[PDB]
Design a protein around this ligand. Structure first.
Ligand SMILES: Nc1ncnc2c1ncn2[C@@H]1O[C@@H]2COP(=O)(O)O[C@H]2[C@H]1O
Lengths: 111, 107
């Protein structure tokens, strides 16, 4: 059950401060990552097809650091913790080992 | 599968060395560290079933840190060719996660 979701142009996918449960892979369209500071919207990046966002919510299970809006009609593949564990557990030993030390390193970094 | 034993306090490799393979710790523990002006700054300690020395392989440059054995250790050698082969053949979503992790670790 790898589910997709379609998102209309100009839809806020999520907002800075929101609860974070999953990441998203862009299957079609583009998205704006941004912050809002005193009613002024400050862009950070634009992501397109085959790129992933919201991944700190996935590994660390905490709030959204930025807002994300769709610049056009987009499709998103939802990536949930259950999928990640399932895919890492079923992976090759060396790949599993790399994923572990990467995640362990990213936790020490973000301290 | 070739293994290698490393004596306690042996430098496995050093920051700045050429990087040809990674290692999975089969026995013992290892210290990952940097050296700044004869002062040694620890980063992490890894133990059994953990892997190091990947970064030279996937990013294709030198060793970013030094590694020493804290006790007698045994290491399974994983050649560069194996690591690239196994990561490239891995599942699309897993590859995508590894990329953004690495991109984050660089920033
Ligand atoms: N915080 C870290 N900084 C640099 N290297 C690290 C760190 N944690 C683990 N390592 C590992 O130490 C290794 C040092 O040589 P590599 O560049 O080949 O790959 C590195 C990583 O696998």
């Amino acid at each position: 059950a790898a589910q997709s979701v379609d998102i209309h142009k100009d839809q806020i996918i999520f907002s800075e401060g929101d609860a974070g449960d999953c990441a998203y892979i862009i299957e079609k369209g583009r998205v704006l990552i941004y912050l809002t500071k005193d009613k002024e919207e400050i862009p950070l990046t634009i992501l397109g097809e085959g790129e992933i966002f919201g991944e700190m919510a996935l590994i660390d299970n905490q709030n959204r650091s930025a807002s994300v809006r769709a610049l056009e009609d987009v499709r998103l593949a939802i990536v949930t913790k259950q999928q990640v564990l399932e895919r890492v557990s079923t992976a090759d030993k060396v790949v599993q080992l790399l994923m572990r030390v990467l995640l362990k390193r990213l936790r020490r970094k973000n301290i």
